[PDB]
Curated annotation (Swiss-Prot), chain A:
Cellular localisation: Cytoplasm
Note: There are 2 genes for uL22 in yeast.
Single GO term (MF): structural constituent of ribosome
Name of the protein described by the UniProt record: Large ribosomal subunit protein uL22A
From Swiss-Prot, chain B:
SUPFAM superfamilies linked to this entry: Translation proteins (SSF50447)
Phosphothreonine found at: T102
A single BP term in Gene Ontology: ribosomal large subunit assembly
Listed name of the protein: Large ribosomal subunit protein uL3
Subcellular location: Cytoplasm
GO CC annotation, single: cytosol
Species classification: Eukaryota, Fungi, Dikarya, Ascomycota, Saccharomycotina
Modified residues (Phosphoserine): S23, S155, S296
GO MF annotation: an example: structural constituent of ribosome
KW DNA repair (keyword) present: no
Glycyl lysine isopeptide (Lys-Gly) (interchain with G-Cter in ubiquitin) crosslink site(s): K38, K135
Disruption phenotype: A mutant confers resistance to trichodermin, a trichotecene toxin produced by plant-pathogenic fungi.
The species this protein was found in: Saccharomyces cerevisiae (strain ATCC 204508 / S288c) (Baker's yeast)
PANTHER family on file: 60S RIBOSOMAL PROTEIN L3-RELATED (PTHR11363), LARGE RIBOSOMAL SUBUNIT PROTEIN UL3 (PTHR11363:SF5)
RNA sequence: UUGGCGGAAAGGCCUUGGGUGCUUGCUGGCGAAUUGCAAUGUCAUUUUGCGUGGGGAUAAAUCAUUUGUAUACGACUUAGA
RNA sequence: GCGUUGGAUUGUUCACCCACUAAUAGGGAACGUGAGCUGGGUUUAGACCGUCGUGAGACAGGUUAGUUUUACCCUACUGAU
RNA sequence: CUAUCUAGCGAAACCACAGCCAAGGGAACGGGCUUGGCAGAAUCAGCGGGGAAAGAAGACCCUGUUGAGCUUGACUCUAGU
RNA sequence: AGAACUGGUACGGACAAGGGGAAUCUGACUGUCUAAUUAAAACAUAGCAUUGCGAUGGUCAGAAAGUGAUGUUGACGCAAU
RNA sequence: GUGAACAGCCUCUAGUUGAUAGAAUAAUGUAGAUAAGGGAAGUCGGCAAAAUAGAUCCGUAACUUCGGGAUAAGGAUUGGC
RNA sequence: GCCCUGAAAAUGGAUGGCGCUCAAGCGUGUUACCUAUACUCUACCGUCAGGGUUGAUAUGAUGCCCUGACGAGUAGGCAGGCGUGGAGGUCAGUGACGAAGCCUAGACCGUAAGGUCGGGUCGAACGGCCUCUAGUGCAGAUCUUGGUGGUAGUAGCAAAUAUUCAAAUGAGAACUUUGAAGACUGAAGUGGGGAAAGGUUCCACGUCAACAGCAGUUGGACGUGGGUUAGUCGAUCCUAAGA
RNA sequence: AGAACUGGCGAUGCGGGAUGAACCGAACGUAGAGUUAAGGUGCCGGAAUACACGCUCAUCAGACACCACAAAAGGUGUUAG
RNA sequence: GUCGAAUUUGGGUAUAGGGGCGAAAGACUAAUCGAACCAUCUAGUAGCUGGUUCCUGCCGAAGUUUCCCUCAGGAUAGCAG
RNA sequence: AUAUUGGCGAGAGACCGAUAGCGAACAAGUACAGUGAUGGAAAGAUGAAAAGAACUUUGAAAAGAGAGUGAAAAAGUACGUGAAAUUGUUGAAAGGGAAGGGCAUUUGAUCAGA
């Protein structure tokens, strides 16, 4: 309960979330922003294509010195990637939201991703060993992911 | 302090930037100055670099220690199929430079030139110029008025011509379209020349002649990212050098506190547009003319195509221009040959070559035989055949 | 509406003929008010969307595969109903 | 504007000589340039000699050995979208 | 084999704010100030001119009425003899 | 050990495995040290020379001892250079 | 087994197949090499690299503490049957 | 007098720039004009000074009012005030019908320190006034503790020749098991054992939240258990340097 | 580098000298109006491309003190003596 | 480089901080050596560096005299509240 | 009669209130480090009561969406409240080699006062 700021009808909306998921926060944010606002089935097809390496997730914020690819032209970017782990997590949350929408009795053909946000979970801490007997952090950046799918109206 | 030992600069600053050319076809940035008394003729031609070979010819150079005896010279052979005239472009003089007033194309365009106007030909609907072809419905009233505007205006007239690349062994299959300036007086006749020549082919015999000095404009062979040592010829650092020795040691003084444009730095080498001048044509041979590679002294029935074909290009079956030395660009690459921009009279030009022998041995190795007939005559009978 | 001229950024200029409206060139009749003593007292041009009608035509590019005249990756050059 | 060298000795700058050359002009750019190099010298710690000092030690006195670290940031430049 | 790209993983140095120049003056070498030149999103790979780059409260020099190692008929003592 | 024949005169056919000579300065040599910048000509060495001492002693320990090392020793020894 | 050999290389018993991987093959690197002619002209300095290398036979200087120098130097041969 | 020669330095650049030639240059004269936190007047704030006013209801004579002048400021001094923890008195002060706290480009008051209110969140205490008291105010101290960034999804995860196919298990297999192939350690081993050390890592079962810098169904991980059998092997006995 | 008197900066803002601690003017509570100081009135830039008498043409003209430089010596350049 | 005797090394043992040990480098003595590590005296002293926490109002300096083992400090007189 | 930072038993405070107060409010001289002498932390709070989420559905599962308990789940044992740095989503605005600021006004948004 108590998702992020949403401006859609809870009666026409269905939500899903995953917390403390050990997946890169930056990659998951880019994956979520790639499908934010999309139709449910179109977003699922796009995520399957990304997993197949047929389309790519455009990296807009966490993209410094990552690399260039030709699949970013449709998104007006040169920097896109294929964050398979984030795509799988978001696909799991999308199918969870589809199940909840079906349970509530929403039109699956009118479902679009009305809201999706990824934020930083508490970091899981490990240690790495560095020259001259030094110890540095090796922390992961897990994600809390949430999304709400709503029936499109006029 | 000073350099303490003077040395000429590494590299030429007039060839900057050392970036990739914007197109695989080098632009002709200058055409011969128009002399309004000569007949209307093309000032350039479009061909493809096939490869190199060697010839023997008597050197006609009075005053030389080695006059009137035989020299072996490298020559580059460029396949030059006739270009089809498919358009006409007029340029009027403006205080801001030359400006294209209008362009009048031919009625019917081959798929070869139409392919240039598409990136995906296989899935296209080939609608190009279909409404333009309707401009010739009954009399081409719009067309003749458009040509009349070119005559009333447009102090410079260029024809739009494209290569017949399906006649070359290239798998490209897409023609190269270029504008060639029409030199010769009576601009009205230039449009008359172009209009009459719509859908018509122009052969290399009408542009180039034997012994003529022509200009080679082509995009050089690309070599990707290159270090300073080979990109500019800078001195290799000693073997003792830490962090590598294929570098430039000092890239700048403390002040100005910036790397200067004149310092050799690593980057892309090659694939640059070059215009190399004063290359002499030694042959204007004809594709239909069997025994292309023969001379008045050999008479052996052999074409210009080397035994086994030009390496990486194939067999030459069209008109070809043989130039002395080498030209920018690699094999299979589109090249444009233009007239010399001045009248060169130095006894290197105006010197009339007559070939004595043309090398037709295989470029695929240490070729021993000019013709398959000679190979059989030498080795005799083999077990496989012959 | 007729014809001509203008390519330097022409996109405008000149002209034949008729139609309609005004005509303060001159002489008349009618109306104004209350915006209350002034309040720019809203009259111009610049895009965009939308609805109603009429006119007009019925593609490409990118990804993916491939090529290698190219190339770190992009990019470039290709080919494929 | 365009060139202004190859070498013997010496860490050397400088100097001198051999030789070619058209010429072997003089300089700056934090006495340009060590996250460009090298470390021959100077300029740590080891060691020898001469002089000085009673001595520990001193020497623009000589000699030998002696770790040259980091760029992935911004800009600049070279290329590339 | 890297470097490059991708899947997964994933730090550190450093960080007044930050980042285009020329000249002027200025704490006498500016990224900011003044006068000019200029100046168009977002970027990738190299690179080592600059950030008087980073690493260390300069180890060279000086001061301190701060030491310490060592030496000598410095001063004052002392084990032993 | 020898001979004949044989071969793209190859044959320690891969592996394996001294470069050599003429000298100069310096330390005799073998050996030892600054672990983590100095392996050296530095230290050590046999050799040479000097000094002290016959035990109620020389040299050196212990705060002191009915305490010790040399000494389970004796000048061809121990101790200090 | 080859080989003087616990040298190097390969194999039998036994054990392992464990180091994050995939795709291309730019620059600059790390490691390994080659290079026509010249042969230290590079450099402080032959640094680094190359050259020599096993075995049999011939031959082997100055000097010397007569013990060495010495594998001096310089040469010839090497397989299979 | 003006101008020219004398008059050569290094990034491209400076009457400030543009530019200016009976000047927009130089010498000189006459006016008009522009504007400083300066000057004149006025308004308001504060400070200082001189006064008026207990003839009352007049509760603020530290009060009210009149008049004149002034106001820069580091080190520094003094004065008047704001705020915090706690304390005595008082407001028979506020509050579960919501105290404190926190958020609030919402409003008001004060020059300011700050104060007050509206809304949201929240849940148990708290405040105005007179006065007392101090462990009483932070932007720095390469300040301390803790947390968090850009760097940055970047550097990188490159020594030890090397892995490949199929099946099984499993939600999921480059990494687990089995089989096949190809290799390596090549007996001074990547083999078989032991001493020091470790202490259950040995083995079985179930099992993957964390670790195995990828992954994982596997493990020297996790949870539960099982396992070390001596007259002859050692300690134990003896003595060595020594204590 | 060191003294004397005074004024300033330090401690000080403002207008001007583009830019500047010291120079010129003027010292500062919050504002309005007016006039000015020094400095300026081609544009940047508010203010006369004002008036008047003359001088100067520079193939490195010249352009407001502090101040950001120029000299001796020359010129039938030109002007006045 | 050395590799059969001044060899390498396991275990036990002895030498402990102004002490040991040192084929000697001020070398080693548990990543610590020109005097190890731990705790305490100790919150050691520092004329030296850094920091020093709310507002407003009023006034408002000095780098000068003399003395000091004094010249980075203090006292004194002066300036100021 | 005088001393008493130790032991035992008490009564108190203008003392501190979990980075404070003893190092230790808690399995604190504990975990852990060092060969050793010694060094030595961090760490309190759901809710009145677990009433700690029965059950349905999606997923292999962790969990999610419903349902439910509860005064409150804006209290879910990662729990009284829940700031800032920093981050995501949505909304609004600006942006030619910084940004932030002052005077004055335009414009947009919002708002008290009679
Ligand atoms: K001393
Ligand atoms: K010392
Ligand atoms: Mg970048
Ligand atoms: Mg490491
Ligand atoms: Mg370590
Ligand atoms: Mg020079
Ligand atoms: Mg070349
Ligand atoms: Mg090196
Ligand atoms: Mg060939
Ligand atoms: Mg220098
Ligand atoms: Mg440098
Ligand atoms: Mg360096
Ligand atoms: Mg040296
Ligand atoms: Mg002496
Ligand atoms: Mg990178
Ligand atoms: Mg500058
Ligand atoms: Mg200067
Ligand atoms: Mg700076
Ligand atoms: Mg500016
Ligand atoms: Mg670099
Ligand atoms: Mg730099
Ligand atoms: Mg210092
Ligand atoms: Mg220091
Ligand atoms: Mg003193
Ligand atoms: Mg003292
Ligand atoms: Mg002392
Ligand atoms: Mg020796
Ligand atoms: Mg020996
Ligand atoms: Mg050493
Ligand atoms: Mg060494
Ligand atoms: Mg044998
Ligand atoms: Mg060679
Ligand atoms: Mg050779
Ligand atoms: Mg030779
Ligand atoms: Mg030399
Ligand atoms: Mg040399
Ligand atoms: Mg060598
Ligand atoms: Mg020999
Ligand atoms: Mg010899
Ligand atoms: Mg002059
Ligand atoms: Mg002016
Ligand atoms: Mg004047
Ligand atoms: Mg005023
Ligand atoms: Mg004041
Ligand atoms: Mg208190
Ligand atoms: Mg409340
Ligand atoms: Mg706020
Ligand atoms: Mg409560
Ligand atoms: Mg305090
Ligand atoms: Mg703070
Ligand atoms: Mg402060
Ligand atoms: Mg700090
Ligand atoms: Mg910290
Ligand atoms: Mg990386
Ligand atoms: Mg690496
Ligand atoms: Mg490996
Ligand atoms: Mg593997
Ligand atoms: Mg297997
Ligand atoms: Mg093997
Ligand atoms: Mg096991
Ligand atoms: Mg892992
Ligand atoms: Mg895992
Ligand atoms: Mg276990
Ligand atoms: Mg026994
Ligand atoms: Mg001062
Ligand atoms: Mg000035
Ligand atoms: Mg004056
Ligand atoms: Mg003006
Ligand atoms: Mg003169
Ligand atoms: Mg010493
Ligand atoms: Mg103190
Ligand atoms: Mg005052
Ligand atoms: Mg000081
Ligand atoms: Mg505590
Ligand atoms: Mg808490
Ligand atoms: Mg509540
Ligand atoms: Mg909470
Ligand atoms: Mg925040
Ligand atoms: Mg930009
Ligand atoms: Mg502004």
């Amino acid at each position: 309960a108590r998702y992020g700021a949403t401006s859609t009808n809870p009666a026409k909306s269905a939500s899903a979330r995953g917390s403390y998921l050990r997946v890169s926060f930056k990659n998951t944010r880019e994956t979520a922003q790639a499908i934010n606002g999309w139709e449910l089935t179109k977003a699922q097809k796009y995520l399957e294509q990304v997993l197949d390496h047929q389309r790519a997730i455009p990296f807009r914020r966490f993209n410094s010195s990552i690399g260039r690819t030709a699949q970013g032209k449709e998104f007006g970017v040169t920097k896109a990637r294929w964050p398979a782990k984030s795509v799988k997590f978001v696909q799991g949350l999308l199918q969870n939201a589809a199940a909840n929408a079906e349970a509530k009795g929403l039109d699956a053909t009118k479902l679009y991703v009305s809201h999706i946000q990824v934020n930083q979970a508490p970091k899981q801490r490990r240690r790495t060993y560095r020259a001259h007997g030094r110890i540095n952090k090796y922390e992961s950046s897990p994600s809390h992911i949430e999304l709400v799918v709503t029936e499109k109206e006029e | 302090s000073h350099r303490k030992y003077e040395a000429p600069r590494h590299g030429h600053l007039g060839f900057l930037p050392r970036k990739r050319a914007a197109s695989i076809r080098a632009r002709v940035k200058a055409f011969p100055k128009d002399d309004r008394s000569k007949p209307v003729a093309l000032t350039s031609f479009l061909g493809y670099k096939a490869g190199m070979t060697t010839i023997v010819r008597d050197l006609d150079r009075p005053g030389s220690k080695f006059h009137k005896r035989e020299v072996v010279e490298a020559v580059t052979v460029v396949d030059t199929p006739p270009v089809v005239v498919v358009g006409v472009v007029g340029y009027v003089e403006t205080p801001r430079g030359l400006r294209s007033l209008t362009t009048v194309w031919a009625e019917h365009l081959s798929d070869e030139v139409k392919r240039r106007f598409y990136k995906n030909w296989y899935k296209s609907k080939k609608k190009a110029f279909t409404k333009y072809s309707a401009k010739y419905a009954q009399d081409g009233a719009g067309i003749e008025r458009e040509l009349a505007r070119i005559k009333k205006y447009a102090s410079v007239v260029r024809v739009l011509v494209h290569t017949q690349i399906r006649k070359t062994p290239l798998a490209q299959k897409k023609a190269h379209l270029a504008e060639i300036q029409l030199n010769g007086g009576s601009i009205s006749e230039k449009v008359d020349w172009a209009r009459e020549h719509f859908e018509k082919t122009v052969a290399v015999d009408s542009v180039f002649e034997q012994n003529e000095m022509i200009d080679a404009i082509a995009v050089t062979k690309g070599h990707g990212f290159e270090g300073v040592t080979h990109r500019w010829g800078t001195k290799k650092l000693p073997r003792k050098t830490h962090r590598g020795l294929r570098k430039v040691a000092c890239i700048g003084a403390w002040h100005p506190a910036h790397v200067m444009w004149s310092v050799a730095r690593a980057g892309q080498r090659g694939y640059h547009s070059r215009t190399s001048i004063n290359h002499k044509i030694y042959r204007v041979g004809k594709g239909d003319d069997e025994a292309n590679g023969a001379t008045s002294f050999d008479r052996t029935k052999k074409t210009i195509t080397p035994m086994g074909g030009f390496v990486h290009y194939g067999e030459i079956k069209n008109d070809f221009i043989m130039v002395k030395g080498c030209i920018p660009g690699n094999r299979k690459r589109i090249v444009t040959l233009r007239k010399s921009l001045y009248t060169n009279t130095s006894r290197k030009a105006l010197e009339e070559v007559s070939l004595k022998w043309i090398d037709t041995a295989s470029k695929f190795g240490k070729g021993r035989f000019q013709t398959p007939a000679e190979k059989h005559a030498f080795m005799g009978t083999l077990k496989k055949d012959l």
